[PDB]
């Protein structure tokens, strides 16, 4: 009964929870996953999954290195508007898109644990992608943002 | 037993003995590390009170 | 509380009350705040100010 | 200038320039950026003083890059004019290297100033 | 690596074999190196092209 | 109201309050160590031991608006600790520009500058103003008049906001007032005969009170309109009230309260009036007012137990005879204690654990044996008060009321 | 020491002050007839030299300024016709071993005014150093900048400046080294 | 001329004319920084215990060095390829090193050697904000620390609470002067291992690497949870 | 000045020979190795081949111990 915003590039992922929002933001100690507990608690709700386009990648990279009110987060606010649901943001400094319009956001001290779980098992069930593909898209984004900040 | 009671007390209390090239330290407890602040550095406390009881101010 | 000397400066801003116990007290006449000067171990017999009022001569039973 | 890391305050720069003046009297400093880099290459420099006053500071900030390879202390003082006065020439001096010695009269002053330098690194 | 070299090295930068033979026996070192073909040194004439 | 005890070889050298308006009081304190210790006022325990990342802390001060914390350390560092994250969470912020000698006292101007008196006789001024070009570097250095035959240490530094000065007491006894801009002395008084350990001021900075190891409290006044328009403090008065030293002085001034509070090597507290220091009266508190007791007797065997720090002692009436004692050094800190009626079992109890000892009078001595109970060994105890010869009631430091040898329902209070 | 004139500034009564340069940063100013210590001005560093400037205010009123230099090059100006309080603190551009400051172009302590209406404001200020460098500041514009630049830095004699004096008109400065 | 293996595969000892430590290659053919290359048909790069810091811990003897050829490792303090080249050699082409630094002056050669090896991915952001590279990678198998900043324990505590999976390794190199000078290495290293076991890092070993570095230590620990 | 140049280049030859000769040696480590354990019996015992695994060959020199 909640969503959580997790990124891997320009590809953002509003993954919903297999329990209640209070159960997500209250306990978090029951996963301890090898693979099956995270596979059961996980639910790939929305994947605003862009491509290797340098413009979209570096745009979401700048919006990740700054506050997270990007157009992909507006797409998530579009594709999760059901009854002003509860969201799990990653960084607390994204407070604007955390609570801008009809989303009860919570990111404190167990949201990091559930992000440890879902970041441990991003590639095994969330996309239709593989481990070398995730590392290749991560290093493409990394070299793009590195040559953007560090000039040439 | 009168001349070695402090010896056996300290040699049973203290830790981190040697093993050849090595030294096997005990890690402490969350009990003490969360019930109390750590001890004062006796070097600096002795420096401050030894200064305030220096000989140049004639205490009595 | 017996007073054996008093003096004023050339502006009337401060005033020296020398007591028979030995102390001196500069009162500030605009607001009646005092300042104690304790050196004389016997009675204060004479007080004077300088012209600018920033030095106070005092004399008593010690010959100082 | 922003990119002139560690810059000395007034007391430290006064004693830095005092030890520069007595090293100049003992003929124990190499004044000028090229002579400072030569002493950096040869490993006979105690510490490097630079001036955060040159209008291209990039003619300086290359000897930091081989100071941090030979872990020799380096410091900035705010005035190239005052550094030239301290080195005892008639020109402004941009950088100055106090050279090494072991029989030197001012060895204790050099060591004290270089420890005060490497506290702020 | 060229920027962190002193200006004397940039002077003699081309003439390494003449330099190091004139140092390893006590002779006079060259003064031009690779920088001899600059247009300013072309404009100079005499000992002031060394200068 | 409350007492927060520390244990063996623990001391406390500085402590500062923090109350952001709308949030709970927060109490930080340095000991003689490398950490700052923030205490939660409920339990009476440390809720945070933040190890400051440089050396042994010599002084602590709190920012004006109370979002940052200066700790001045033995290796010459001044470390800023970000306080405004909530009660309990402390972050490292910035190590200010280093120096040689240890910084012995700190003060803040405002949110902007931080002043520090050091043990080389100097007074540095750093800028803690974030997002300036000169953030963290020390802007000024001032040097006090050194002693002729020993080193000089600047022991106390305060900022005076009504004027723009720094008042400073050092170990020659001299008290100096420094213009902050231009960083330079206005006037020096040769007040005390030995060091000036602590000095403070009132709200509108018409008075500066100062005290140290020569055990007099000096008052420097600027209350006259001519004094305020000329920026001229006068050495107004001087009182001898303390017995040995004064190591701490502070002032409070409100609509129905204006007193300066002072204490030192002699263990008693002294209250004086702020605006009526020389004229008015004063009150020397008792050295102990036992709101928490350390002695109780039992009528059987005519015996009395008494516990100082980490040892208990028992003697009987007759004259009198010390029958037993327990210098338990597995312990580090003591707290309250109770004996069974009939004098059988003692229970000692601190906020971390408690321990119960059977006693048997063997004549001119006792025999004392631990009786193990891991529930007692795990529980926090404030009060133990013995329902029966076996049943006791335990008040825990986290507001639990057990009955051992189990649970009293306890209603909640309006917050 | 240096001798100078001071005005009471509540009467129009002048008296001479002697000014003694002491150990820490101290200048002890005291009366030239009674010897009473009037005030003291402390600079931060090694006090090396000082000079006296005067500036007129109105008919028959002037103001005395003490100008004292660190060894490092930073200069304090103290107004001392009131209590000895700092009014300006600036820094010599260049200059690291500073031996001698002097003013000139008006009434110095070496060109003294015989009559109180003949007191003039000094135009020039020369700060002479240990290398022989003499910075020269023009105080008709260099009283405002607080990092003022010299109008010229003379470098002609190469060892320590021990005298520098201005001619009474203020058209020659005399550098000299012992 | 004879290469023997070490306790950790990807680390070898080339014995013979110079019994010296060595790693494999993932760079085909070439050195990166003029380190000596030994061929035994197969190419090998000499590690130096003085030029690098982890090699000094290996030479002092680190038994459970969690840098190991079946993992992925997070390197918080290299500034240049002189150690992460050998870490990519020992982790092989199966895994990935995240070399994260702040000062972008030697980040140029960091990215330059990350061009040559796909094992090495760089991050050019300061390691006290791991949230700024949340969206790049997570769940590493061993963190490495070589930061010479005063808040070493807090920086690697934040990085291990955000990016280190449970029961993994922590290797932290501690310089004594960057925390506290004038007091000896024994007290400052005891203080830092207590500061790091304040977090969920069970300390396993520390060693002082004295012939290679003055007043340093390498502390290994296992991340509890 | 030219025989000072001669001695200086000889010194620089030996300096470079020194640094790139010591780069290709291996020095025996001497570091205070410390191991952290549990309550008291793990400290009282011998650290029983926890990383030596032979007490004859692969215990007391640490440049490469082994696990057979």
Of H150, H153, H195, the CB nearest to F54: H150
Subunits in contact with chain G (3 or more CB pairs closer than 8 Å) = C, D, F
d(Cα F74, Cα F70) in Å, to the nearest integer? 13
Enter the DSSP assignment of D7: B
CB distance F119 to B47 below 8 Å: no
F296 C-beta neighbours (distance < 10 Å), count: 13
Indicate yes or no: CB of F10 within 8 angstroms of CB of B45.
no
CB contact under 8 A, I35 and B24: yes
Interface test with chain F among D4, D5, D9, by most F beta carbons within 10 Å = D9
Alpha-carbon torsion, ordered F186, F190, F194, F197, to 10 deg: -30
Which chain F residue has its CA at the smallest distance from C31's CA? F224
Distance between CA atoms of residues F156 and F168, nearest Å: 6
Q: Which helix (H) or strand (E) holds H60?
A: helix H54-60
Query: For H180, which of F49, F54, F92 is closest by C-beta distance?
Result: F54
Interface of F with G (CB under 8 A): 140-143, 145-146, 179, 182-186, 188, 230-232
Q: How many CB pairs under 8 A join D and G?
A: 36
Burial of A61: CB neighbours in 10 Å, binned 0-12, 13-18, 19+: buried
**Nearest CA distance, H85 vs chain F (angstrom):** 31
Among the listed residues F243, F239, F251, the one whose alpha carbon sits nearest the alpha carbon of residue F282:
F239
Q: Is G94 on the interface with D (CB under 8 A)?
A: yes
I 3-62 residues inside an 8 A Cβ radius of H: 23-36, 50-51, 62
Resolution for this experimental structure (Å): 8.6
Q: Say yes or no: D103 contacts chain E, CB-CB below 8 A.
A: no
Element (H, E) at D110: helix D107-119
Question: Do the two chains C and B touch, given a threshold of 8 Å on CB pairs and at least 3 pairs?
Answer: no
Is F98 touching D (CB cutoff 8 A)? Answer: yes
Token readout for E6 is 């002193």
Residues H74, F194: Cα–Cα separation, whole Å? 57
N-term to C-term CA, chain C: 23
C-alpha I32/C-alpha G170 separation (Å) is: 75
CB contacts of B29 in chain H (<8 Å) are none
Q: How many angstroms away from the CA of G24 is the closest CA of chain F?
A: 7
Q: Does B12 touch chain I (CB under 8 A)?
A: no
Task: Please tell me which chains touch B, using 3 or more CB pairs under 8 Å as the contact test.
Answer: F, H, I
DSSP I41: H
For residue B16, give the 3-state DSSP assignment: coil
CB G51 within 8 A of CB G67: yes
- H42 closest CA partner among H22, H59, H58: H22
F185 CA to chain B: closest CA distance, Å? Answer: 26
| Closest chain F CA to residue H128 | F92
Residue F275 CB: number of other CB atoms within 10 A?
16
Tell me which residue in H125, H132, H139 faces A119 most closely, judged by beta carbons. H139
Q: Show the tokens assigned to A149.
A: 């900040």
Dihedral of alpha carbons A33, A36, A39, A41, sign: negative
Of all residues in chain I, the one with the smallest CA distance to H218 is: I33
Structural contact between residues A24 and A108, judged by C-beta atoms closer than 8 angstroms: no
Rounded CA-CA distance F85/H129 in Å is: 16
Q: To the nearest whole angstrom, how far is the Cα of B26 from the nearest Cα of chain I?
A: 6
DSSP codes of every residue in C3-63: EEEEEE-TTSSEEEEEETTSEEEEEETTTTEEEEEE--SS-EEEEEE-SSS--EEEEESS-
Residues I67 and I52 sit within 8 Å (Cβ to Cβ): no
User: Which of I65, I68, I54, I53 minimizes the C-alpha distance to I29?
Assistant: I65
Cα–Cα distance for residue pair C44/C17, rounded to 1 Å: 9
Distance from CA of D8 to the nearest CA of E (A): 24
Contact B26 I60 (CB under 8 A): no
Least Cα distance to B20 among I46, G96, F27 occurs for I46
Cα–Cα dist D20/F16, whole Å: 44
Q: Is H124 within 8 Å of chain A by CB?
A: yes
Q: Which residues in F lie closer than 8 A to residue C32 (C-beta atoms)?
A: none
* Cβ neighbours of F133 in D, within 8 Å: 2
What is the crossing angle of helices H81-91 and H107-116, to 10°?
30
Query: Is H40:H14 a contact under the CB 8 Å cutoff?
Result: yes
Contact residues of C toward F, CB < 8 A: 13, 28, 30-31, 33-36
Q: Out of F49, F74, F92, whose CB is closest to H154?
A: F92
Contacts of H129 (CB under 8 A, 6+ apart): none
Handedness of CA A29, A32, A33, A37 (dihedral sign): negative
Domain ranges of chain D: 1-121
Residue contacts between C and F (CB atoms, under 8 Å): 22
Q: What is the DSSP string of D48-86?
A: EEEETT-SSGGGTTTHHHHHTTTT--EEEES-HHHHHHH
D37 touches E: beta carbon within 8 Å: yes
- Indicate yes or no: CB of H136 within 8 angstroms of CB of A142: yes
- Residue E28's closest chain I neighbor by CA? I2
Asked if B27 and H203 come within 8 Å (Cβ–Cβ), the reply is yes
Tokens of G14: 């002048």
CB-based contacts of G75-78 (< 8 A; 24+ apart in sequence): G75/G101, G75/G127, G76/F182, G76/F184, G76/G41, G76/G43, G77/G53, G78/G27, G78/G41
Answer yes or no: are the C-beta atoms of A100 and A109 closer than 8 Å. Answer: no
Distance of alpha carbon D60 from alpha carbon E4, whole angstroms:
10
- Residues in chain I, total: 68
Domain D1-121 CATH superfamily:
Ribosomal protein L30/S12 (3.30.1330.30)
Structure-token pair, residue A44: 């790939």
Residues of D in contact with E7 (CB under 8 A): 34
The verdict on a CB contact (< 8 Å) between C55 and G36 is yes
- H or E segment to which residue E9 belongs: helix E7-11
The shortest C-alpha distance from F236 to chain C (Å) reads 5
Contacts with D39 from chain I: Cβ below 8 Å: none
Closest by CA position to A119, among listed A59, A31, A19, A30: A31
The answer to whether the CB atoms of D116 and F100 lie below 8 A apart is yes
Supply φ then ψ for residue H221, to 5 degrees: -155, 165
Q: Which residues of A touch H71 (CB under 8 A)?
A: none
By the CB < 8 Å criterion, does G36 face chain C? yes
**Neighbour tally for A14: CB within 10 Å:** 22
Q: Tell whether H191 is within 8 A of chain I (Cβ).
A: no
List beta partners, residue G62. Answer: G56
Exposed, middle or buried, F186 (CB in 10 Å: 0-12/13-18/19+)? buried
Q: Do chains D and I touch (3 or more CB pairs under 8 A)?
A: yes
């Amino acid at each position: 009964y909640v969503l959580t915003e997790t990124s891997a590039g320009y590809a953002l992922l509003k993954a919903s929870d297999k329990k209640i929002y209070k159960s997500s933001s209250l306990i978090q100690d029951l996963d301890s996953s090898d693979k099956v507990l995270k596979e059961f608690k996980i639910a790939a709700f929305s994947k605003f999954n862009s491509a290797a386009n340098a413009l979209e990648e570096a745009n979401s990279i700048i919006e990740g290195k700054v506050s997270s009110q990007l157009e992909k987060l507006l797409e998530e606010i579009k594709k999760d508007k059901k009854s002003t649901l509860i969201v799990s943001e990653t960084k607390l400094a994204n407070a604007i898109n955390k609570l801008g319009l009809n989303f009860n956001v919570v990111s404190d001290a167990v949201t990091l644990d559930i992000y440890r779980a879902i970041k441990e098992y991003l590639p095994e069930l969330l996309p239709g992608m593989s481990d070398n593909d995730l590392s290749k898209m991560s290093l493409g984004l990394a070299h793009s943002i590195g040559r953007h900040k560090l000039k040439f | 037993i009168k001349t070695k009671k402090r010896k056996t007390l300290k040699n049973l209390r203290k830790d981190s003995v040697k093993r050849g090239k090595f030294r096997v330290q005990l890690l402490s407890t969350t009990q003490d590390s969360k019930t109390l602040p750590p001890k004062k550095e006796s070097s600096i406390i002795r420096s401050k009170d030894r200064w305030l009881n220096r000989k140049a101010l004639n205490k009595g | 509380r017996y007073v054996s000397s008093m003096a004023i400066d050339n502006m009337g801003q401060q005033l020296a009350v020398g007591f028979a116990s030995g102390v001196i007290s500069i009162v500030s006449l605009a607001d009646l705040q005092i300042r104690l000067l304790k050196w004389h171990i016997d009675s204060v017999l004479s007080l004077s100010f300088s012209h600018d009022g920033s030095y106070l001569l005092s004399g008593g039973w010690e010959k100082v | 200038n922003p990119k002139a890391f560690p810059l000395a305050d007034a007391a430290l720069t006064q004693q830095i320039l005092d030890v520069v003046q007595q090293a100049a009297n003992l003929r124990q400093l190499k004044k000028g950026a090229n002579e400072a880099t030569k002493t950096l290459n040869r490993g006979i420099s105690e510490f490097i003083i630079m001036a955060a006053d040159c209008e291209p500071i990039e003619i300086l900030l290359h000897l930091p890059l081989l100071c941090e390879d030979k872990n020799v202390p380096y410091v900035f003082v705010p005035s190239r004019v005052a550094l030239g006065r301290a080195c005892g020439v008639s020109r402004p001096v941009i950088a100055a290297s106090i050279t090494t010695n072991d029989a030197s009269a001012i060895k204790t002053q050099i060591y004290a100033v270089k420890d005060k330098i490497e506290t702020l690194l | 690596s060229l920027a962190k070299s002193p200006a004397s090295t940039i002077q003699i930068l081309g003439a390494e074999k003449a330099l190091f033979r004139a140092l390893k026996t006590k002779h006079d070192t060259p003064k031009y190196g690779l920088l001899y073909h600059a247009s300013l040194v072309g404009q100079a004439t005499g000992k002031n092209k060394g200068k | 109201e409350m007492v927060i005890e520390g244990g063996k070889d623990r001391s406390i050298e500085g402590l500062c309050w923090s109350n952001v308006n709308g949030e709970s009081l927060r109490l930080f304190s340095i000991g003689g160590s490398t950490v700052v210790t923030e205490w939660d006022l409920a339990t009476g325990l440390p809720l945070r031991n933040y190890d400051c990342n440089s050396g042994v802390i010599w002084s602590i001060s709190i920012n004006d608006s109370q979002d940052k914390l200066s700790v001045g350390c033995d290796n010459g560092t001044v470390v800023l600790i970000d306080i405004s994250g909530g009660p309990g969470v402390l972050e490292h912020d910035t190590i200010l520009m280093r120096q040689e000698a240890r910084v012995l006292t700190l003060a803040w101007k405002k949110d902007d500058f931080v002043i520090g008196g050091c043990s080389d006789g100097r007074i540095r001024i750093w800028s803690a103003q974030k997002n300036d070009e000169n953030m963290g570097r020390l802007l000024h250095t001032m040097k006090v008049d050194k002693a002729k035959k020993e080193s000089t240490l600047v022991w106390s530094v305060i900022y005076l906001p009504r004027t723009d000065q720094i008042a400073s007491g050092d170990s020659t006894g001299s008290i100096k007032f420094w213009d902050f801009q231009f960083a330079t002395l206005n006037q020096s008084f040769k007040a005390h005969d030995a060091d000036v350990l602590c000095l403070t001021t009132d709200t509108d900075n018409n008075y500066v009170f100062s005290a140290g190891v020569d055990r007099k409290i000096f008052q420097f006044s600027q209350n006259t309109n001519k004094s305020q328009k000329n920026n001229r403090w006068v050495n107004s008065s001087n009182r001898l009230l303390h017995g040995n030293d004064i190591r701490a002085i502070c002032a409070y001034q409100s609509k129905g309260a204006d007193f300066l509070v002072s204490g030192g090597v002699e263990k008693t507290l002294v209250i004086n009036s702020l605006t009526s220091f020389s004229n008015g009266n004063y009150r020397k508190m008792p050295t102990v007012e036992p709101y928490s007791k350390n002695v109780l007797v039992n009528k059987e065997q005519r015996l009395v137990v008494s516990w100082s720090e980490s040892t208990v002692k028992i003697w009987t009436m007759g004259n009198y005879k010390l029958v037993c004692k327990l210098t338990l050094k597995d312990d580090q800190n003591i707290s309250t204690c109770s004996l069974s009626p009939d004098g059988q079992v003692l229970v000692v109890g601190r906020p971390s654990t408690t321990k119960v000892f059977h006693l048997q009078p063997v004549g001119n001595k006792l025999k004392v044996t631990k009786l193990d109970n891991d529930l007692l060994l795990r529980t926090s105890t404030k009060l133990v008060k013995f329902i029966d010869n076996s049943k006791i009631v335990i008040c825990s430091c986290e507001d639990d009321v057990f009955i051992v040898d189990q649970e009293v329902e306890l209603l909640e209070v309006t917050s | 020491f240096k001798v100078a004139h001071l005005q009471n500034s509540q009467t129009n009564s002048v008296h001479g002050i002697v000014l003694l340069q002491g150990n820490n940063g101290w200048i002890n100013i005291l009366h030239s007839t009674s010897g009473l210590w009037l005030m003291g001005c402390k600079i931060e560093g090694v006090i090396t030299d000082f000079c006296i400037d005067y500036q007129p205010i109105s008919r028959g009123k002037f103001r005395t300024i003490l100008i004292a230099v660190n060894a490092y090059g930073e200069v304090w100006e103290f107004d001392l016709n009131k209590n000895g309080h700092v009014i300006r603190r600036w820094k010599d551009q260049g200059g690291v071993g500073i031996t001698k400051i002097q003013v000139g172009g008006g009434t110095t302590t070496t060109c003294p005014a015989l009559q109180i209406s003949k007191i003039k404001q000094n135009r020039w200020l020369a700060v002479g150093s240990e290398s022989g460098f003499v910075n020269l500041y023009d105080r008709n514009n260099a009283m405002t900048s607080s990092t003022p630049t010299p109008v010229a830095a003379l470098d002609q004699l190469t060892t320590t400046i021990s005298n520098l004096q201005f001619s009474p008109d203020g058209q020659i400065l005399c550098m000299a080294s012992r | 001329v004879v290469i023997e293996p070490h306790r950790h595969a990807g680390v070898y000892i080339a014995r013979g004319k110079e019994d010296l430590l060595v790693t494999k290659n993932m760079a085909p053919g070439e050195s990166v920084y003029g380190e000596k290359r030994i061929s035994v048909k197969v190419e090998y790069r000499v590690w130096n215990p003085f030029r690098s810091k982890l090699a000094a811990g290996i030479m002092g003897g680190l038994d459970e060095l969690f840098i190991a050829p079946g993992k992925k490792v997070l390197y918080l303090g290299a500034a240049s390829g002189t150690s992460v080249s050998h870490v990519s050699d020992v982790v092989g082409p199966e895994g990935v090193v995240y070399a994260v630094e702040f000062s972008h002056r030697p980040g140029r050669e960091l990215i330059s050697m990350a061009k040559k090896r796909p094992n090495i991915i760089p991050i050019i952001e300061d390691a006290r904000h791991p949230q700024k590279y949340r969206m790049l990678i997570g769940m590493v198998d061993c963190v490495f620390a070589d930061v010479a900043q005063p808040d070493q324990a807090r920086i690697i505590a934040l990085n291990s609470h955000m990016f280190l999976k449970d029961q993994g390794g922590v290797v932290i190199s501690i310089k004594a002067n960057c925390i506290d000078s004038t007091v000896d290495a024994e007290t400052v290293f005891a203080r830092e291992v207590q500061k790091l076991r304040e977090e969920r890092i069970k300390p396993l070993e520390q060693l002082t690497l004295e012939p290679y570095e003055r007043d340093h230590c390498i502390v290994v620990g296992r991340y509890m949870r | 000045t030219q025989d000072s140049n001669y001695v200086r280049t000889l010194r620089q030859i030996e300096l470079k020979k020194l640094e790139k000769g010591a780069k290709q040696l291996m020095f025996k480590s001497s570091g205070n190795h410390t191991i952290f354990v549990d309550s008291r019996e793990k400290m009282n015992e011998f650290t029983p081949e926890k990383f030596f695994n032979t007490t004859s060959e692969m215990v007391n020199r640490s440049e490469n111990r082994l696990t057979k």
